[PDB]
Amino acid sequence: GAMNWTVDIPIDQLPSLPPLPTDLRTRLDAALAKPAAQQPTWPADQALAMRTVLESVPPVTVPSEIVRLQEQLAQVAKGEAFLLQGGDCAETFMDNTEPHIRGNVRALLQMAVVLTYGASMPVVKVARIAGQYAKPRSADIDALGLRSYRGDMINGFAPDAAAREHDPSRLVRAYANASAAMNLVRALTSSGLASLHLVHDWNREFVRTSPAGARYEALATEIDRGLRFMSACGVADRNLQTAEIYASHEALVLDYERAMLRLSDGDGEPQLFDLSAHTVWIGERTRQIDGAHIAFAQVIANPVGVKLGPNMTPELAVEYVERLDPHNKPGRLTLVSRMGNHKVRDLLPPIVEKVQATGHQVIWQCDPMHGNTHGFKTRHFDRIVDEVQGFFEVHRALGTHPGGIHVEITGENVTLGGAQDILAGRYETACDPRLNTQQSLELAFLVAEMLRD
Amino acid sequence: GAMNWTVDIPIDQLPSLPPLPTDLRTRLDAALAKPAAQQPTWPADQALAMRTVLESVPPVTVPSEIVRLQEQLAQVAKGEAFLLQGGDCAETFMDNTEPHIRGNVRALLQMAVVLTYGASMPVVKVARIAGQYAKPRSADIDALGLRSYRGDMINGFAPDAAAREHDPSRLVRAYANASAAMNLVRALTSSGLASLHLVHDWNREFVRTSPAGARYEALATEIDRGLRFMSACGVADRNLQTAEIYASHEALVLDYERAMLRLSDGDDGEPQLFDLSAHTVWIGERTRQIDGAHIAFAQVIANPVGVKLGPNMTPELAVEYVERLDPHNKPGRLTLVSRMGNHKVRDLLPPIVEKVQATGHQVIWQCDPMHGNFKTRHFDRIVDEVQGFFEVHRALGTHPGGIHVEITGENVTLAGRYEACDPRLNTQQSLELAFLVAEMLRD
Amino acid sequence: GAMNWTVDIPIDQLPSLPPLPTDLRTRLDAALAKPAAQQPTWPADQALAMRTVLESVPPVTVPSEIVRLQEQLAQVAKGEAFLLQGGDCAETFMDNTEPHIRGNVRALLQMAVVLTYGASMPVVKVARIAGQYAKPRSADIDALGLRSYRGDMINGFAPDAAAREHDPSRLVRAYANASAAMNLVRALTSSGLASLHLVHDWNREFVRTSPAGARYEALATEIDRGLRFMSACGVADRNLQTAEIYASHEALVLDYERAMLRLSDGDDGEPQLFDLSAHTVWIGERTRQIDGAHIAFAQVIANPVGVKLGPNMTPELAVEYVERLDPHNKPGRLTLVSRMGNHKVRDLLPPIVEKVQATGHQVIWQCDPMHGNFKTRHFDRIVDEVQGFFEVHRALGTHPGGIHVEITGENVTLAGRYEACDPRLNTQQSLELAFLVAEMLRD
Amino acid sequence: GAMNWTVDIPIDQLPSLPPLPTDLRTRLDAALAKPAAQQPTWPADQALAMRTVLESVPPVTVPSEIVRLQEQLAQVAKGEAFLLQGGDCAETFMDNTEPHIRGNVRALLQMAVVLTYGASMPVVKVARIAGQYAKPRSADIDALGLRSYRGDMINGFAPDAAAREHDPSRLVRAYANASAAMNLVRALTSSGLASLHLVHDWNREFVRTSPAGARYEALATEIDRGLRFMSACGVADRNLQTAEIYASHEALVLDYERAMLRLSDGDGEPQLFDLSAHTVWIGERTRQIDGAHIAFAQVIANPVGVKLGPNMTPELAVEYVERLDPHNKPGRLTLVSRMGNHKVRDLLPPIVEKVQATGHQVIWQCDPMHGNTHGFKTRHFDRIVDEVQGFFEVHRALGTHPGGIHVEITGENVTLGGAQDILAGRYETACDPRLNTQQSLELAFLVAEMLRD
Numbered sequence A, D: 001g002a003m004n005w006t007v008d009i010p011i012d013q014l015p016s017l018p019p020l021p022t023d024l025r026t027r028l029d030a031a032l033a034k035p036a037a038q039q040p041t042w043p044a045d046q047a048l049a050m051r052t053v054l055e056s057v058p059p060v061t062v063p064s065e066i067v068r069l070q071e072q073l074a075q076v077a078k079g080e081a082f083l084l085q086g087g088d089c090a091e092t093f094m095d096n097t098e099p100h101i102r103g104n105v106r107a108l109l110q111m112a113v114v115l116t117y118g119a120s121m122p123v124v125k126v127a128r129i130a131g132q133y134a135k136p137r138s139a140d141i142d143a144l145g146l147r148s149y150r151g152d153m154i155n156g157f158a159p160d161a162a163a164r165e166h167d168p169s170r171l172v173r174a175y176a177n178a179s180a181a182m183n184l185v186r187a188l189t190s191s192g193l194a195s196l197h198l199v200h201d202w203n204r205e206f207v208r209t210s211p212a213g214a215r216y217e218a219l220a221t222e223i224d225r226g227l228r229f230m231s232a233c234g235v236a237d238r239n240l241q242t243a244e245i246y247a248s249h250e251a252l253v254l255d256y257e258r259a260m261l262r263l264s265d266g267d268g269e270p271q272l273f274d275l276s277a278h279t280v281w282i283g284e285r286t287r288q289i290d291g292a293h294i295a296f297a298q299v300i301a302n303p304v305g306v307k308l309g310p311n312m313t314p315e316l317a318v319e320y321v322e323r324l325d326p327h328n329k330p331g332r333l334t335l336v337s338r339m340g341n342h343k344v345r346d347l348l349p350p351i352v353e354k355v356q357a358t359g360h361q362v363i364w365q366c367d368p369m370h371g372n373t374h375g376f377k378t379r380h381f382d383r384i385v386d387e388v389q390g391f392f393e394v395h396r397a398l399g400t401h402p403g404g405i406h407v408e409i410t411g412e413n414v415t416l417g418g419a420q421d422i423l424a425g426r427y428e429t430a431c432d433p434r435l436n437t438q439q440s441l442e443l444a445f446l447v448a449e450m451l452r453d
Numbered sequence B, C: 001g002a003m004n005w006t007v008d009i010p011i012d013q014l015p016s017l018p019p020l021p022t023d024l025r026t027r028l029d030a031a032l033a034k035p036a037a038q039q040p041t042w043p044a045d046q047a048l049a050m051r052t053v054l055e056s057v058p059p060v061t062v063p064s065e066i067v068r069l070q071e072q073l074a075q076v077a078k079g080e081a082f083l084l085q086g087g088d089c090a091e092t093f094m095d096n097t098e099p100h101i102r103g104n105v106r107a108l109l110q111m112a113v114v115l116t117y118g119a120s121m122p123v124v125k126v127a128r129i130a131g132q133y134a135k136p137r138s139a140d141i142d143a144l145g146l147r148s149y150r151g152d153m154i155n156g157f158a159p160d161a162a163a164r165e166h167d168p169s170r171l172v173r174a175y176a177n178a179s180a181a182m183n184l185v186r187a188l189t190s191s192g193l194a195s196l197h198l199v200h201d202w203n204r205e206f207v208r209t210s211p212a213g214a215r216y217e218a219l220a221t222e223i224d225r226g227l228r229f230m231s232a233c234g235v236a237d238r239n240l241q242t243a244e245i246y247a248s249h250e251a252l253v254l255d256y257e258r259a260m261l262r263l264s265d266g267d268d269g270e271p272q273l274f275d276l277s278a279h280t281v282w283i284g285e286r287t288r289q290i291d292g293a294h295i296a297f298a299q300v301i302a303n304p305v306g307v308k309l310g311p312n313m314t315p316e317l318a319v320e321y322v323e324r325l326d327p328h329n330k331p332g333r334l335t336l337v338s339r340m341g342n343h344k345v346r347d348l349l350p351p352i353v354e355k356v357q358a359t360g361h362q363v364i365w366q367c368d369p370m371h372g373n374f375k376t377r378h379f380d381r382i383v384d385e386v387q388g389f390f391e392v393h394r395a396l397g398t399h400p401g402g403i404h405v406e407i408t409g410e411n412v413t414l415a416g417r418y419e420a421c422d423p424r425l426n427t428q429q430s431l432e433l434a435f436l437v438a439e440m441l442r443d
């Protein structure tokens, strides 16, 4: 009933399923009693109401997928597979569309083909998708004098007061959008978009028309010839038709992640899983060792990652390892270094040494974005490439596994600067400069060479 | 906002759709200008706004799955596969939960094992799920004097006036629930719920504890032995770990179906319109007016479609459906869904089949043994309608191509456990029917 | 030369063998210095010359197939596969032809389908073929007063003195015939004769025209339905197109077996000796002297081996065989082949099984229902020995691991069609036995 | 009973199977009434006796294999697969040993891996093995004053009179040796020797230790990376474990090839097949258009090839096409050019044009040996490579398919001259210089480059 230009969709009040068990609830309550940074400031009663809704909705992922990912990540940890993680820096509800989702899935796949060939081993494909709807902020008041935008799960991007109020109905809107995206993602990956031959064709079309193309023709051709070799040998080409794309996001809004907790079915044992995603990580600003995010990560069975910035000490890294991998399950923990290209060569070696000596097997993954940011906020492609380069140099020097990358990207032709010639044009992100389709593929070729190198 | 128990969606600055090929536009407007039975009566302007929202959401299904289905249904049409369709008579937002969905997916898969074994050919598995949120009514006002319940996509089940107001915001709720359900059925089918060995284990648990169990032990053991045979022969079994479950519902609310249209990139001779609210949809008895909106809408979409055929069907009208809906003679584009009562199917269906077979088109003949037979149905009349249906086809040499059944995973009933519709067979009776029909397929 | 109906092979400038690892040499000479029963009596010098020829020919089988077999037999030993061994009682050079070989391969495969279905687990298929050219005799002189026929590897079947002279040149003829037969069984099994669907079709033709057919229709149909189930589930079926048929014979003529030894490149802890005249060989009742050449020879080769156990077997001797021949406790290296008469198997076999099971070694228990029961055998006593054998294992909780049977593709019998041995079951009776044993496996 | 050093093995006289049918026999008799060049000169009665023996022995190959090869050759003819044919120039009974047979099968496989990768399409693998026991001679009396050696099927290599008498018992000895070799070949190819990963390892070991190695490191590495790509993608690696190696030889001794004729089983129709081999070809000296070899080829259903030398006219080639492919079955006929590297660029184009205009699809295959022969008879590697090079140049100029190679080789480290530095050392052939293991693999790398080229 609006003169508004807004439809109001009623949130159906549906009877609840039985509660989670008690031991697990006591554990959980004790974890969530810890202080949590960067939480939305909506009322408790509204929060509980919205949580209750989410407690009975169909999950975004199911436990047995997560168990599967855990096994695949174990191989990454042991130096036999490589982790590729990429997607929007922030999803918006506005752009949570087929074209945009297709675009990101295809950019990620395109990268995966090149990395799989370059690494010469399987690539675990993890999208920042289907829930990356919440972000920290350091500042309470933005350049316009407004409450900061904290992502669509918390408030709206529009530069006005009303949009910036923290509204917990966005938890439900968030769930609907994540669920819908994930449905699309499963559909696309199982019905042809993730066909290897098709994906590499896009790679050839890139090499043929990009101004940088010439640089990557040899490797592109070599991949092509790899592929044809497979037909030529008459392989059962079934596993070439589909690919698995896992969902991930920063676990930031605890009202959301706790509402999406589920207990798996007996057949070992039933465990607590966060079914909002397949894997989640904890950001720089919320990884307080005695805070609720880390404690939450302790209780869930999903694989998890922690972002490690320039202030990290090898001692604190070791504590993360002891809190988050208390059973020595290889690949249950990923430590994600993001330090800046100027710093990674010095800062990372001691951390790796100290963590390796623990006997635990973590995944070392490089986030070359969140360390290299300087009208618009932009990042230089060269400094991005160089951080991955240094990251590889650390591991090669130490005999450890450079296990993957974490990268912020899109399928759109946006405008980061320096792929081939680069901002006022197409700066579309609701956050950080998002390394357009062409740059992420270039990075993939450059990292492939670091792997053959 | 939360305070008001609503999610507020702004419509201005929503991603729009590109313009249709002039000609699809024209054809689609022409189809929808025709009269449409059983439509909700909410205001145009509110409907438009809701449609505009759905025009920008992720689809429930994608074109290439629907194209894959079409090929699988072509095998059925040709007498080389069998179609099993089943699920809730009506889904409700209140039961759109992980256990309820698991249960239905399980029940369906359990049927499919038994049917696959008894048919000796693949079974195309289509659930009534992720959209079966709208039903027709013969009366406007019900037994309590209220505006009839028409399914959660239109109004609410509660017995009060305000709950029965037609609410367009239910288009968007219906979408969210559908796509959430679809996400789950894809996850489950691809990650272990659809493992053949696990599914038959439940059949074995049913045979061993149902009071009917005895009756079906022999067949259940034979199936078990057939499965073990597969390991014994070392046949490579990724294909035994997953199954495909396609989504379907009655295409009833044209405001919903039209908003979920999308255009393919093309490839068999140009761009097509696909209804991406489902993989396949059918048109019911009360909306199949030959020059009505629903039939004409079915003509403009690429999806496979079916049409329910009741006791007053003539062979001539059946032929007209076939010529309108299968104008290119694509096997399996059209399913004729017979629902006639077990007392009538033996007499009424043969002439229809003969006339239609003489057109040279290859439809799927599917038996809906429910909608012809508290409101309850006798199991024996249901089984008997499928039995009569099988006799017709045996007599004529035609393919008895499938069944369409209304069921659940729940232990439903009579005052005991009656749960938004006509009476499902419960999970047990579904399985039992599957066993019974597998004997029809063997005999 | 042709004029003399001979092929002339020069021995000087023949490719020699490299020297054995000193230690295999020593062990092999020690084994062969032991006394050997049932050996041909031809001159040393002629034997040596023939051996020298065989030392340089292509092997009949290669080490890695024998290693593959060992792994498949380990599954049998563990109660997870079943061993079917069968073929001519004695091959003859005169029947070593494409139709006769096809027939036997067919009959064996036909049995294997039925057994695979009835066992509900893989069947390891081992033919008596490509070398079963030597037999023991209890008498030196036969009913006609002639030196007994001992198989075409030693002398001729014709009833005359010159034909019964032991002729060492038969070692080389035996090799040529064996390797020619093996070539054919590999070709046939890999190129369509071993297609599961084609093989069951013959079973279906048997059920439909044998006068016994009625008896086996139910099972044959169940199998057929099990097969169709496999297509129906879309399971990928290269594995349904081919089968492995392993070669075996009684290791009897030590001049032959020793000349066909070859040395592996190694890999489980050094180089081994493999008898490449076959994949697997067994030692008969009359040559299994515990401190004799044959047993000691079996100890020096890597192949899987079996030993025939007759009515006078003690549990203690059985244990000694097991400790000598399976000294490393490798499941499936050793097959104990029980052959006791149907009147005796129920009493004599349990104690043997118990004692041997208590050693913690895992042998394969195989039933040879022939050699314990014109010289003819009653089908009913044969079936009954396998039946008794199954009862023993059911009673003890042990695996009834397989059968060893003497058969053919030919329509043999009694004065009508008697064809170099004891009476085979003919092709029909083999199949019938397979059906009968598959019921034992199901029941 | 010898003071001789010879064992005499009796040839068992075994009852016969039913005869071939009559139509097919009349056809056959009329074919064999034609004159035949280069036949052994043993008596007719001895010949018939030995033929009768061979008529009932188990066949060397079976019809359904041959049908399969026909289909695979159809794809070669249509430009979608590549034919590799190689082995001993002449097999001997002496060397018909496991080591030697393993050696040749592995050399052929090693070639196939490189060619399969370079061609980017399947390679049909055809050995000169299991019957290549007979050769033509131009001269009646050799340099020693003896009747020429005509191969082990006909007489013996030893420089003495008695050995050189043509003895038809060698038909049976030939059959036994061919049968035994073929048995080995099936065993090896089905049980691990033909495993792709294993074979390429030998290729890497070659690249690492050959003095030419350095030349081929890039391609070798690129293949390796192709292979690892296959694991990395998780392909059903079953078709990587085994390979098909067909048997072939020159059909020269008609007493042999006719004795090995068999009629296939009904299920189209039963046909005459020569089961001494999978495919056979007719040499330069026996391809008289109205002779028995060509007529024999007409009656059998096997795929066949004809060698085409420098005297070939495009007209005569067309006649071969019309006699031997009268039903237009693609790949039933292979025309095998062997012209010399100095001549192939001029002589071959007109032949191809004239044959292409017939509408038939033959396979064009290059025999770069039998045209480049000059104490010992040797061939220069460079002239061998150059003929293949020219052969490719003809087809590239004409838009036709360069369909394969036919090459004489071995697994032995023999001494041809010029792989890396090359005769008195290891000249072991009973015929023409046989291009040792290392040279044939080098040729394979060089031809691979012609295919990517």
Ligand SMILES: N[C@@H](Cc1c[nH]c2ccccc12)C(=O)O
Binding pocket: A109, A110, A112, A113, A116, A122, A123, A194, A195, A196, A199, A239, A240, A241, A242, A243, A244, D232, D233, D234
């Ligand atoms: N399914 C395999 C191979 C594959 C299919 N499509 C892909 C797309 C990109 C990379 C690899 C693939 C994998 O995921 O690795």
Ligand SMILES: N[C@@H](Cc1c[nH]c2ccccc12)C(=O)O
Binding pocket: B109, B110, B112, B113, B116, B122, B123, B194, B195, B196, B199, B239, B240, B241, B242, B243, B244, C232, C233, C234
């Ligand atoms: N994938 C095959 C076999 C199969 C797997 N799981 C199943 C469950 C039910 C029936 C069949 C199956 C199919 O869906 O048909």
Ligand SMILES: N[C@@H](Cc1c[nH]c2ccccc12)C(=O)O
Binding pocket: B232, B233, B234, C109, C110, C112, C113, C116, C122, C123, C194, C195, C196, C199, C239, C240, C241, C242, C243, C244
């Ligand atoms: N390859 C499987 C299945 C099979 C193929 N052909 C067969 C013939 C008989 C029995 C089984 C089979 C096996 O040999 O066991």
Ligand SMILES: N[C@@H](Cc1c[nH]c2ccccc12)C(=O)O
Binding pocket: A232, A233, A234, D109, D110, D112, D113, D116, D122, D123, D194, D195, D196, D199, D239, D240, D241, D242, D243, D244
């Ligand atoms: N079987 C496939 C792949 C293969 C297996 N082993 C090989 C050896 C060489 C070349 C290819 C192969 C083929 O023959 O092509």
Ligand SMILES: [Cl-]
Binding pocket: B160, B161
């Ligand atoms: Cl009221």
Ligand SMILES: [Cl-]
Binding pocket: C160, C161
């Ligand atoms: Cl006498």
Ligand SMILES: [Mn+2]
Binding pocket: A089, A090, A370, A408, A431, A432
């Ligand atoms: Mn970011």
Ligand SMILES: [Mn+2]
Binding pocket: B089, B371, B406, B422
């Ligand atoms: Mn209904």
Ligand SMILES: [Mn+2]
Binding pocket: C089, C371, C406, C422
């Ligand atoms: Mn016997």
Ligand SMILES: [Mn+2]
Binding pocket: D089, D090, D370, D408, D431, D432
């Ligand atoms: Mn030559």
